[PDB]
Amino acid sequence: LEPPPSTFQPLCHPLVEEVSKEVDGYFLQHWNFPNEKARKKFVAAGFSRVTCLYFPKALDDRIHFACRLLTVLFLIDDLLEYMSFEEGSAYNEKLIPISRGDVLPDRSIPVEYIIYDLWESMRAHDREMADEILEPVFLFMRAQTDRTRARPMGLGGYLEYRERDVGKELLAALMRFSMGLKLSPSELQRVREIDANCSKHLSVVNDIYSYEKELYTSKTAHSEGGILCTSVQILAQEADVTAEAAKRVLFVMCREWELRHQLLVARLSAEGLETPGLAAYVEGLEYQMSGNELWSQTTLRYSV
Amino acid sequence: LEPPPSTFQPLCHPLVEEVSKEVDGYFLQHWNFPNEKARKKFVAAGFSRVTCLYFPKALDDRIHFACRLLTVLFLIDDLLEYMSFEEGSAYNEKLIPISRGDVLPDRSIPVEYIIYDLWESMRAHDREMADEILEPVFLFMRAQTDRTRARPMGLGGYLEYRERDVGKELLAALMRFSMGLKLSPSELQRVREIDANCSKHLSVVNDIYSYEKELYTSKTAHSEGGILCTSVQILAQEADVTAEAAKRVLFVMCREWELRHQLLVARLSAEGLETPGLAAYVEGLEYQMSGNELWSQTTLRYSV
Ligand SMILES: C=C(C)[C@H]1CC[C@@]2(C)CCC[N@@H+](C)[C@@H]2C1
Numbered sequence: 001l002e003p004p005p006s007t008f009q010p011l012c013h014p015l016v017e018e019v020s021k022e023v024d025g026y027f028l029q030h031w032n033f034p035n036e037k038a039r040k041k042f043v044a045a046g047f048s049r050v051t052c053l054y055f056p057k058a059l060d061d062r063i064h065f066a067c068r069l070l071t072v073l074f075l076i077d078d079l080l081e082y083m084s085f086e087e088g089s090a091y092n093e094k095l096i097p098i099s100r101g102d103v104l105p106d107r108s109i110p111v112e113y114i115i116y117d118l119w120e121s122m123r124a125h126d127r128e129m130a131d132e133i134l135e136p137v138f139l140f141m142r143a144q145t146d147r148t149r150a151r152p153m154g155l156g157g158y159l160e161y162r163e164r165d166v167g168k169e170l171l172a173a174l175m176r177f178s179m180g181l182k183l184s185p186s187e188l189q190r191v192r193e194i195d196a197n198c199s200k201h202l203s204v205v206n207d208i209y210s211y212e213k214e215l216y217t218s219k220t221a222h223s224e225g226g227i228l229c230t231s232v233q234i235l236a237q238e239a240d241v242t243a244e245a246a247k248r249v250l251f252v253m254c255r256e257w258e259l260r261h262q263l264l265v266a267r268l269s270a271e272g273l274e275t276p277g278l279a280a281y282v283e284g285l286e287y288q289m290s291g292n293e294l295w296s297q298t299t300l301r302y303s304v
Numbered sequence: 305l306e307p308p309p310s311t312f313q314p315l316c317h318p319l320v321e322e323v324s325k326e327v328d329g330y331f332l333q334h335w336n337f338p339n340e341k342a343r344k345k346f347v348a349a350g351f352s353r354v355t356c357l358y359f360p361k362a363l364d365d366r367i368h369f370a371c372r373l374l375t376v377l378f379l380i381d382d383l384l385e386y387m388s389f390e391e392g393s394a395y396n397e398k399l400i401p402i403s404r405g406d407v408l409p410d411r412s413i414p415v416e417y418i419i420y421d422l423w424e425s426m427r428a429h430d431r432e433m434a435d436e437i438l439e440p441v442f443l444f445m446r447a448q449t450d451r452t453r454a455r456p457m458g459l460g461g462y463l464e465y466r467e468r469d470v471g472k473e474l475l476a477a478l479m480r481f482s483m484g485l486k487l488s489p490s491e492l493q494r495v496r497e498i499d500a501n502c503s504k505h506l507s508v509v510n511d512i513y514s515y516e517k518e519l520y521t522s523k524t525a526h527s528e529g530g531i532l533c534t535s536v537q538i539l540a541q542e543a544d545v546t547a548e549a550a551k552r553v554l555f556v557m558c559r560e561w562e563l564r565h566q567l568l569v570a571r572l573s574a575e576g577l578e579t580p581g582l583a584a585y586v587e588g589l590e591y592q593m594s595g596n597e598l599w600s601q602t603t604l605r606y607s608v
């Protein structure tokens with residue numbers, strides 16, 4: 001479908017090609033793929049490409065960390081579709097003390113030592129900023145198997161939940177880590193509304209492009225893990241239109257959230273509340289929204 | 305507010321002007337308007353014009369009946385805004401047996417004898433078709449003061465409620481009455497989906513244009529009777545955008561309903577289920593949709 005006009009200019013990290021080869025190559029060696037078709041599909045998705053589109057102004061020696069984290073969480077996200085909520089929760093909860101470093105990984109299990117080595121290397125580079133990503137990640141991981149996915153949801157309730165399932169906080173903390181962007185608790189508190197608005201944009205844009213994939217998943221995967229949980233289906237139900245019609249309407253709403261983002265940012269400066277770090281932060285949020293769109297509309301993950 | 309492209313072409317009844325003078329003249333003579341400013345505002349609204357846009361193919365000697373019914377229901381609709389739900393209910397329930405003709409009107413009370421004389425004359429012209437408007441009107445009347453108006457609603461739940469509050473069913477029965485268009489129970493059951501889709505279009509288009517009037521009413525009139533009940537406010541809540549942003553998204557949504565209307569009619573025709581009566585009926589529904597939009601975007605009722 002044709003995207004409505006956007007004033008957001010998507011940016012990609014300069015080292016995207018080098019880092020993609022580095023991180024793809026890593027997972028191709030360590031991760032247990034079912035077959036050659038899955039290995040090809042993994043590379044075709046371009047998980048480091050979306051990361052570089054998400055954080056184009058990340059520091060050169062930190063971008064690979066973000067690519068590794070997003071890549072493994074992508075792989076797990078698909079893995080959970082074949083599990084019940086109970087099995088999926090146990091799977092995630094196992095990785096949490098390992099992510100903290102409190103528990104050694106079983107080195108015969110790829111997901112365990114990949115997660116462990118990753119978080120160790122991140123704390124080794126920047127202990128303080130790496131630690132601030134932990135809880136936001138665990139927040140996301142626990143939302144993935146929340147029983148609310150099996151409950152009827154309206155648009156408002158969905159977006160409220162999706163802020164965790166889309167991993168808004170983890171993306172924010174990881175962006176700051178990758179850019180070395182440090183913010184006071186006061187600064188963080190100032191941009192709450194901007195965060196909330198950005199979350200809806202990320203969520204719905206993903207919903208729009210990943211619908212066909214998730215519809216197939218709902219028909220073939222686990223009854224619980226593969227459950228269809230998206231704004232596309234919700235708006236289609238609520239407004240009595242096709243999923244395609246819902247996509248077109250939702251895309252216009254996304255552009256309204258872009259307009260709101262700009263107004264909130266301009267208001268932040270007008271109220272004299274904008275700091276140099278905050279200016280870089282809200283600009284970074286814009287890159288996430290536009291980077292998420294560019295990748296979603298081009299990745300084979302959603303088109304095939 | 306620029307409306308998205310539409311293929312629906314509006315049509316107005318040829319006798320719109322002379323019928324307007326006849327019907328406006330009647331109400332100016334009988335209705336208890338508080339002052340001259342209110343009388344001028346009443347004429348400026350063009351209640352017979354929107355009726356003639358709703359039913360452009362009504363029979364020449366029946367269009368005035370439709371203009372009278374819509375006019376008196378328009379006037380009551382505004383009246384209810386200064387009442388509580390309880391007062392509004394008692395006001396409406398009083399008119400229901402009078403509409404049936406089971407209870408005689410108090411001739412000293414304009415609304416009572418206007419309602420009585422109207423339905424009596426409509427029954428005299430076409431007894432059967434007039435009776436089939438009764439219950440749909442009563443359903444609309446009771447929805448006007450329903451306490452669900454003051455309780456939390458999502459988009460879907462609102463559209464389901466608004467179908468009664470927008471009087472979709474009475475508008476259909478009135479259209480058939482005015483055109484002398486008789487349909488069998490079987491025939492009406494075949495276009496139920498088309499009716500439901502049409503209702504959402506009428507509702508939201510009205511919501512979009514009448515928002516400024518209703519926002520002001522909610523701030524100035526009775527906190528119950530004048531309560532803000534509109535898709536504009538609801539979508540603005542769910543998506544956390546301005547009312548203006550909600551309008552733009554809702555208008556695109558209206559175009560999807562127009563597209564659905566065309567698909568449903570085309571399928572009805574392809575299945576060989578589109579009788580001559582149904583073809584006129586579904587065309588009549590389109591006139592209601594395009595006619596509602598034309599009047600809404602030009603009437604002084606919403607612009608002043
Ligand atoms: C892989 C992640 C880090 C999470 C957060 C980021 C995303 C919402 C972006 C869209 C795709 N989903 C799978 C991921 C899931």
Ligand SMILES: C=C(C)[C@H]1CC[C@@]2(C)CCC[N@@H+](C)[C@@H]2C1
Pocket residue numbers: 373374377378381469470471472475510
């Ligand atoms: C007053 C009526 C006859 C109903 C049916 C017709 C309308 C939907 C037209 C828009 C305004 N509303 C108030 C009315 C409500």
Ligand SMILES: [Mg+2]
Pocket residue numbers: 077078
């Ligand atoms: Mg997923």
Ligand SMILES: [Mg+2]
Pocket residue numbers: 077144165
């Ligand atoms: Mg997921």
Ligand SMILES: [Mg+2]
Pocket residue numbers: 206207210211214
């Ligand atoms: Mg998705």
Ligand SMILES: [Mg+2]
Pocket residue numbers: 003006
């Ligand atoms: Mg673009």
Ligand SMILES: [Mg+2]
Pocket residue numbers: 381382
């Ligand atoms: Mg009203």
Ligand SMILES: [Mg+2]
Pocket residue numbers: 381448469
């Ligand atoms: Mg009303």
Ligand SMILES: [Mg+2]
Pocket residue numbers: 510511514515518
């Ligand atoms: Mg209105």
